[PDB]
Amino acid sequence: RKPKTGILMLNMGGPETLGDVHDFLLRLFLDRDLMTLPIQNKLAPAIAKRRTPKIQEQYRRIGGGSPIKIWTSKQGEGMVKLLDELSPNTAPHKYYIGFRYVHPLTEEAIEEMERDGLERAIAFTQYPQYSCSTTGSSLNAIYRYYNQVGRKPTMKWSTIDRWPTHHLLIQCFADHILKELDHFPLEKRSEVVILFSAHSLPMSVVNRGDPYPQEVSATVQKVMERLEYCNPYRLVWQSKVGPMPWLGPQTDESIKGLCERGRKNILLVPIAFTSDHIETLYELDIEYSQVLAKECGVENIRRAESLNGNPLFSKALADLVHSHIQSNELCSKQLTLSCPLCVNPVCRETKSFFTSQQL
Amino acid sequence: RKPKTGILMLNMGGPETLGDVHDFLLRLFLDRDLMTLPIQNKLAPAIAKRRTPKIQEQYRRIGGGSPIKIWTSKQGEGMVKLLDELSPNTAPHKYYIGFRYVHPLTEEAIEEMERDGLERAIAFTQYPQYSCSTTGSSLNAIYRYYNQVGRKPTMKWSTIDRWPTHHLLIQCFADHILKELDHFPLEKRSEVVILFSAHSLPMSVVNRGDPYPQEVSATVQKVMERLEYCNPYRLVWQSKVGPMPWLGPQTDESIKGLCERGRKNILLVPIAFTSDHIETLYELDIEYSQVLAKECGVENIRRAESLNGNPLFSKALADLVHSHIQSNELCSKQLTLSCPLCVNPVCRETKSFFTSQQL
Ligand code: HEM
Ligand code: HEM
Ligand SMILES: C[C@H](CCC(=O)O)[C@H]1CC[C@H]2[C@@H]3[C@H](O)C[C@@H]4C[C@H](O)CC[C@]4(C)[C@H]3C[C@H](O)[C@]12C
Ligand SMILES: C[C@H](CCC(=O)O)[C@H]1CC[C@H]2[C@@H]3[C@H](O)C[C@@H]4C[C@H](O)CC[C@]4(C)[C@H]3C[C@H](O)[C@]12C
Numbered sequence: 084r085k086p087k088t089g090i091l092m093l094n095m096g097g098p099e100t101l102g103d104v105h106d107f108l109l110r111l112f113l114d115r116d117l118m119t120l121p122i123q124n125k126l127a128p129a130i131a132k133r134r135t136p137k138i139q140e141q142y143r144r145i146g147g148g149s150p151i152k153i154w155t156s157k158q159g160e161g162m163v164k165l166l167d168e169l170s171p172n173t174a175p176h177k178y179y180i181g182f183r184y185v186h187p188l189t190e191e192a193i194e195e196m197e198r199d200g201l202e203r204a205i206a207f208t209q210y211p212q213y214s215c216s217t218t219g220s221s222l223n224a225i226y227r228y229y230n231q232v233g234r235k236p237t238m239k240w241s242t243i244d245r246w247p248t249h250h251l252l253i254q255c256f257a258d259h260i261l262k263e264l265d266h267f268p269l270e271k272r273s274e275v276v277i278l279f280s281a282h283s284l285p286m287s288v289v290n291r292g293d294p295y296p297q298e299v300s301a302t303v304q305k306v307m308e309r310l311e312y313c314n315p316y317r318l319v320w321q322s323k324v325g326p327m328p329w330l331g332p333q334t335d336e337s338i339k340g341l342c343e344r345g346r347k348n349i350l351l352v353p354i355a356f357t358s359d360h361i362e363t364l365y366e367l368d369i370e371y372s373q374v375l376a377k378e379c380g381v382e383n384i385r386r387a388e389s390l391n392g393n394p395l396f397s398k399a400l401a402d403l404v405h406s407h408i409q410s411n412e413l414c415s416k417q418l419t420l421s422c423p424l425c426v427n428p429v430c431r432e433t434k435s436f437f438t439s440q441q442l
Numbered sequence: 443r444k445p446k447t448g449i450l451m452l453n454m455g456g457p458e459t460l461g462d463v464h465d466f467l468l469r470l471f472l473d474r475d476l477m478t479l480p481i482q483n484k485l486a487p488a489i490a491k492r493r494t495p496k497i498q499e500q501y502r503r504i505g506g507g508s509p510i511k512i513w514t515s516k517q518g519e520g521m522v523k524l525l526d527e528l529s530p531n532t533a534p535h536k537y538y539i540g541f542r543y544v545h546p547l548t549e550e551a552i553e554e555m556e557r558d559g560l561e562r563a564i565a566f567t568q569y570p571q572y573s574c575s576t577t578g579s580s581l582n583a584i585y586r587y588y589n590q591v592g593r594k595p596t597m598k599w600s601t602i603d604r605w606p607t608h609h610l611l612i613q614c615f616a617d618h619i620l621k622e623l624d625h626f627p628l629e630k631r632s633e634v635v636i637l638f639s640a641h642s643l644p645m646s647v648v649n650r651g652d653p654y655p656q657e658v659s660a661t662v663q664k665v666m667e668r669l670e671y672c673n674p675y676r677l678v679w680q681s682k683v684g685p686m687p688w689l690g691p692q693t694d695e696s697i698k699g700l701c702e703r704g705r706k707n708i709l710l711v712p713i714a715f716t717s718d719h720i721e722t723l724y725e726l727d728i729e730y731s732q733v734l735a736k737e738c739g740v741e742n743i744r745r746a747e748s749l750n751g752n753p754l755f756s757k758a759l760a761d762l763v764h765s766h767i768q769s770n771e772l773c774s775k776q777l778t779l780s781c782p783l784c785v786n787p788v789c790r791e792t793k794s795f796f797t798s799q800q801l
């Protein structure tokens with residue numbers, strides 16, 4: 084009987100096939116909510132065509148592309164089935180995928196949401212921890228959309244802008260870690276170092292007051308608390324790109340460092356991006372890993388699987404949307420506060436957009 | 443009857459009067475566990491001699507010195523009181539103050555503990571969040587003492603090396619925040635920005651894998667959690683000393699940035715050091731205060747009071763020692779893992795010292 088409440092699942096998206104790498108990078112380097120460059124409209128196209136090969140090669144190393152679209156759709160379907168039974172008064176619920184750099188683009192999703200004449204629209208970020216470069220950018224695109232077209236929303240908007248410590252999210256992480264620990268030799272289970280690895284941020288972003296580092300750190304603590312501190316751990320940062328300073332310890336140097344110090348069993352945990360993505364140097368480069376073994380004698384380096392399709396995850400997503408609906412919140416209290424050194428005038432416009440929504 | 447169980451309260455200490463500033467700084471710049479300098483025994487004395495004036499001036503700005511000794515004794519007394527009732531089997535309990543850079547020095551306390559013929563010693567750090575530069579140095583001192591004294595412990599040791607999320611520590615923080623929120627105008631109370639301010643670390647220490655940032659971030663989340671996210675917040679880092687890069691955002695830069703962006707009511711929270719200490723630029727310099735208020739219109743900048751003498755705090759300390767005793771742990775799981783890029787050979791020796799303890 085026609086969709087009443089829409090759930091816009093926000094994420095950066097990812098190249099479906101190596102053939103999509105170029106336009107993925109193009110939009111990424113063009114995103115001013117993510118980064119600002121001189122003559123950006125001219126430089127973005129250049130940087131894209133340039134790194135495309137290097138990035139296609141990395142995706143080939145992981146299967147030939149990103150499975151984010153499929154995974155997100157599967158979780159989206161599962162979330163809906165639960166919501167339709169959990170919240171009959173807001174049903175039927177329908178999910179929309181809003182990727183930032185690839186189709187379905189955020190704008191394309193909003194446009195479709197408007198045409199379906201939904202009553203309520205929920206901007207639901209798929210990043211548990213908040214960064215102005217990920218969730219912030221996705222939220223800004225929504226504000227940018229209506230402002231671009233030059234007209235007001237025909238729907239009631241609200242947002243779930245962060246959920247770093249949602250109990251079911253923490254349970255899923257704990258479950259996957261225990262599962263992977265089972266794959267290490269029984270005699271070494273106790274010695275396994277749990278290395279939580281999240282994507283790093285440039286120090287310039289960290290220093291302007293980005294919320295991300297603190298929230299990822301919160302997720303980590305909740306997870307270890309659930310696991311009753313069964314193993315030692317560290318929160319490290321990966322995939323750092325460029326010569327500029329990024330928040331460390333770097334994941335690669337940390338793995339090597341740990342091996343040089345006798346820790347031969349390591350469990351990497353994707354603590355800040357719920358879908359499979361590009362792995363680290365010691366996981367992909369046979370040369371680097373072999374040397375590490377010859378010199379330090381590394382025994383086991385495993386990675387916990389992504390929350391990809393765990394049914395308990397869809398339940399996590401449905402639980403979040405449900406609670407949100409019951410609370411009547413328009414956004415978290417944290418969104419009402421911009422970075423201390425924020426220099427993007429769109430940010431607060433986006434904030435007002437959500438806090439000023441009807442209902 | 444004689445002291446059965448001894449509780450060694452570890453901290454860096456602080457100059458009791460302006461006259462004690464020099465040797466405080468001398469012992470600090472000489473600390474290898476906190477700082478590694480070339481020909482350190484040569485440069486330390488010089489640095490101390492040169493910084494004394496500036497540091498004496500800072501302490502004068504806050505009353506003439508540090509109240510850490512008095513406060514730690516009072517808390518220690520209260521802790522012992524509660525312990526003799528809570529843990530009859532390990533009673534009588536006696537607390538010893540072990541400061542790193544001032545009397546009573548860590549070594550003096552150990553030496554006295556030995557003479558008291560205790561049946562069990564507990565190295566209890568007063569820093570709830572672990573850093574190799576704070577708790578690590580104090581623990582390494584215990585190992586360095588027995589090692590340099592060329593003798594073995596006559597007591598069975600164990601350590602409470604961290605407690606970033608202890609439920610009563612969190613309750614004390616929330617109580618002090620609510621209490622301070624009451625000092626702002628009722629109409630503006632919901633507009634107050636809670637700025638958790640912790641002492642920063644050099645980026646070189648952060649990148650080596652220091653545990654501190656993630657643990658401080660955990661304390662913050664637990665506190666806001668208890669406060670049910672009543673106000674927006676940010677975790678910033680203060681007193682970064684020197685020209686080298688330290689973890690930001692800086693407290694001074696954030697306060698200014700915030701004011702320039704409309705946030706006129708700010709509540710500073712001493713989230714990582716439980717005793718009064720040097721305040722920030724906008725709390726001391728009258729000139730910066732004026733400039734800021736003139737071109738930003740700051741309305742209220744308040745600092746929550748240090749957990750200094752809150753009885754619930756003494757209760758927190760006793761609750762910790764009690765659980766620690768019943769758990770029979772020798773140290774936390776986290777202490778068994780060194781920084782992935784640790785280059786201090788003593789660290790690993792200190793670890794073995796505690797994990798190898800009898801019982
Ligand atoms: C302002 C901070 C950030 C900047 C400047 C940034 C930049 C970039 C760039 C340039 C790429 C393209 C890859 C390349 O060309 O080498 C990329 C990819 C990516 N970024 Fe970020 N990023 C930031 C923060 C984040 C955060 C917080 C996350 C976490 C969820 C993240 C997740 C990703 C993912 C998942 C990819 C796809 C690559 C992969 O699978 O590893 N990024 N980022
Ligand atoms: C490894 C990194 C650190 C370095 C290099 C460092 C260095 C210093 C120095 C040189 C001083 C003397 C004052 C000055 O010359 O400016 C000082 C004082 C002090 N430090 Fe640190 N420190 C570090 C980490 C920390 C941490 C993590 C804490 C947190 C508990 C801390 C708490 C203090 C306190 C409470 C004082 C007394 C002065 C004040 O109130 O600011 N320091 N530190
Ligand atoms: C000058 C600008 C930084 C401006 C600023 O910080 O205020 C920096 C950041 C991005 C840099 C560009 C990107 O790194 C992409 C290219 C990298 C090449 O090695 C040089 C040209 C190249 C096009 C760089 C030119 C210049 O160093 C840029 C444009
Ligand atoms: C890694 C990439 C260059 C890739 C390449 O040359 O092949 C460079 C070029 C543009 C750079 C970004 C832009 O200079 C804009 C930002 C500048 C800040 O000082 C750091 C973050 C910041 C977001 C930079 C991160 C990183 O250094 C980037 C993304």
Ligand SMILES: C[C@H](CCC(=O)O)[C@H]1CC[C@H]2[C@@H]3[C@H](O)C[C@@H]4C[C@H](O)CC[C@]4(C)[C@H]3C[C@H](O)[C@]12C
Nearest residue numbers: 478479480481485486488489492646684685686
């Ligand atoms: C060279 C050494 C760093 C060595 C290293 O990183 O391997 C650095 C760190 C501490 C520095 C010293 C400290 O900053 C104290 C002094 C600061 C003055 O501005 C220069 C001399 C001065 C004495 C510095 C000399 C030199 O730059 C030092 C000694």
Ligand SMILES: C[C@H](CCC(=O)O)[C@H]1CC[C@H]2[C@@H]3[C@H](O)C[C@@H]4C[C@H](O)CC[C@]4(C)[C@H]3C[C@H](O)[C@]12C
Nearest residue numbers: 476477478479496644645646682683684685686
């Ligand atoms: C803060 C102080 C300068 C104070 C002043 O000029 O008033 C400077 C001079 C010596 C510096 C220290 C020395 O350079 C030795 C270390 C160098 C590392 O890169 C950072 C930590 C490190 C321990 C430095 C901390 C801080 O930058 C110090 C202590």
Ligand code: FES
Nearest residue numbers: 215421422425430
């Ligand atoms: S960059 Fe964080 S609020 Fe604008």
Ligand code: FES
Nearest residue numbers: 574780781784789
């Ligand atoms: S410096 Fe952290 S364990 Fe040695």
